Amino acid sequence: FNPFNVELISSLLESIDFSMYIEKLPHCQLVGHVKRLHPNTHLEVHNEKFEVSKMIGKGAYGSVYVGKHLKSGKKVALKQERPTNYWEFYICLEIHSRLTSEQMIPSYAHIDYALVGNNSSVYISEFSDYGSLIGVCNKVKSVTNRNMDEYVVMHLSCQMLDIVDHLHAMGIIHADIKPDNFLLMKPICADPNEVSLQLIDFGVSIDMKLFPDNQTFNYVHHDDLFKCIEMRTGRPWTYQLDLYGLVSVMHVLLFGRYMEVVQRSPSTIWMPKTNVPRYFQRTMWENIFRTLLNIRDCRTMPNLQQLRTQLKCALAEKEKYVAEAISKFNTILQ
Ligand SMILES: Nc1ncnc2c1ncn2[C@@H]1O[C@H](COP(=O)(O)OP(=O)(O)O)[C@@H](O)[C@H]1O
Ligand SMILES: [Mg+2]
Ligand SMILES: [Mg+2]
Predict the structure, then answer these.
(1) Rounded CA gap, 204 and 4, in Å?
(2) Which of 106, 166, 228, 319 could cross-link with 244 by S-S, CB 3.0 to 4.6 Å?
């Protein structure tokens, strides 16, 4: 079974009359034809006018632009895709309908306005001036000529675990967890519980509530970098795919490079090829990586809040240093 299959997705959306639903939403405008985003222009959704300012990313099938809602003055991202990405809108709508935690609402992208054409969609959401973890990590490294501080990465990992934990509680698999798809929305606070990250880009997410309970998947990514452990050993997967992605992000944050996994021969345990330095909190990181990468089956996922506890205990041992590191981090990014 392949949960990313384009015809499956069409079938799923039709089965729940998605089109009929979004036609009723006041922040969504259906139109015949959506123009290509272009710098220094204006865009309207109903009554609301937006400046379209500068390109952020641009591929053959879409782009992201920064712009501004003229009335409120708020900066926005404008995300355009061909063909129309209904599925991305569906996941975003479901996430915010299933949320009950006041704490977690800022940590998932919210589509404020949607312009939905026959050819193309444009989704508008809050713009982050700090950008993705990729941009933040590269900025910090270029200024310091060092890897991101170990304890700042603990603080960020604690946050990512919390966001993924609540997402999985809602029966959603993001399925594209990478540093590119976490935004830093605001500076870091000393309190590890304060969320400053936001998960974005639900383009290939999986909604488990659309499938029977006990449903699993066996589709295998082509690119080795993105194969989770189950995909490498001919086994079924569900939430494991996101947990694999979490490790890959932590790896990029800690080491400035992309994760390769290997069996730690002669055992069957999978771990990153990179060795955690002995003067890092090595036992802690190894526990975290091992627990997230090596999962018995789809019936029971590891306790993510236990991992957060391990990180908070390490952060608590050095509260003075941590406050200092976060301050330097925030100052770099001002
Ligand atoms: N709301 C936003 N604020 C700031 N930057 C953003 C925002 N949305 C997207 N970006 C930038 O654009 C990149 C691509 O956006 P994303 O929604 O992930 O598109 P794609 O589906 O093409 O990966 C992000 O990794 C980020 O660097
Ligand atoms: Mg993305
Ligand atoms: Mg995407």
Answers:
(1) 7
(2) 228
Contacts of 213 (CB under 8 A, 6+ apart): none
Continuous H helices in the chain? 6-15, 18-22, 86-98, 133-144, 150-169, 229-232, 240-255, 282-293, 304-317, 319-332
Exposure letters 265-277 (e unless 16+ CB within 10 A, then b) = eeeeebbbebebe
DSSP letter assigned to residue 213: T
Structure method: X-ray
Residues 6+ positions from 118 with CB-CB distance below 8 Å: 32, 33, 84
3-state class of 160 per DSSP? Answer: helix
Report the distance separating Cα 313 and Cα 310, nearest Å: 5
Any binding-site annotation on 79? yes
How far, in Å, is the centroid of ligand 3 from the Cα of 90?
A: 14
**Exposed/middle/buried for 280, CB within 10 Å: 0-12, 13-18, 19+?**
middle
CB 51 within 8 Å of CB 67: yes
Residue 189, number of CB atoms within 10 A of its CB? 13
At 169 the three-state DSSP class reads helix
> Ligand 2 mean position to 197 CA, how many Å?
14
Query: Which of 135, 71, 149 has its CA nearest to residue 333?
Result: 135
Contact 247, 287 (CB under 8 A): no
Question: HSE on the CB side for 274, CA within 13 Å?
Answer: 19
Q: How many helices (H) and strands (E) does the chain have?
A: 10, 13
> Which residues, chain by chain, have CB under 5 Å from ion ligand 3?
201, 203
